[PDB]
Amino acid sequence: ACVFFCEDAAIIGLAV
Amino acid sequence: ACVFFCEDAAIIGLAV
Amino acid sequence: ACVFFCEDAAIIGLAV
Amino acid sequence: ACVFFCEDAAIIGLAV
Amino acid sequence: ACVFFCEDAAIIGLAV
Amino acid sequence: ACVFFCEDAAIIGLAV
Ligand SMILES: [Cl-]
Ligand SMILES: [Cl-]
Ligand SMILES: [Cl-]
Ligand SMILES: [Cl-]
Ligand SMILES: [Cl-]
Ligand SMILES: [Cl-]
Ligand SMILES: [Cl-]
Ligand SMILES: [Cl-]
Ligand SMILES: [Cl-]
Ligand SMILES: [Cl-]
Ligand SMILES: [Cl-]
Ligand SMILES: [Cl-]
């Protein structure tokens, strides 16, 4: 698994 | 929800 | 389709 | 853009 | 790599 | 966080 990142601005990581 | 980005090169955002 | 990237640190692309 | 589903148990949709 | 499905209504697959 | 499913054929889950 690895961490994707999105913009909310804050950086949010999502583990997949 | 937040915006993930991919490479197409252009930057494309995808709202999730 | 486009390439999203995650952090594993290594950069990993994922085609979608 | 569409609704993906995941099992949380309950089934939840996710607008991608 | 596999086929995820979403409801668009029709069910559509997505090769991830 | 939940389990998404994809068709690989077998059905596989993916913890997102
Ligand atoms: Cl912030
Ligand atoms: Cl997470
Ligand atoms: Cl461009
Ligand atoms: Cl979008
Ligand atoms: Cl490395
Ligand atoms: Cl890939
Ligand atoms: Cl929709
Ligand atoms: Cl949602
Ligand atoms: Cl496949
Ligand atoms: Cl596709
Ligand atoms: Cl879970
Ligand atoms: Cl998994």
Which value in Å is the resolution of this experimental model? 2.0
Which amino acid does the sequence have at C3?
V
C-alpha distances out from residue A9 to A3, A6, B2, B14, C15, Å: 18, 10, 10, 15, 26
Q: Which residues of D1-16 are buried (b: 16+ CB within 10 A; e: fewer)?
A: ebebbbeeeeeeeeee
> In sequence order, which residues have a C-beta less than 8 Å from that of residue B10 and are 6 or more positions away?
none
> Which tokens in the block code for residue C14?
């994922």
Q: Do B4 and C2 touch (CB under 8 A)?
A: no
D interface with E, Cβ–Cβ < 8 A, is: 1-5, 13, 16
Task: Please indicate the experimental technique that yielded this structure.
Answer: X-ray
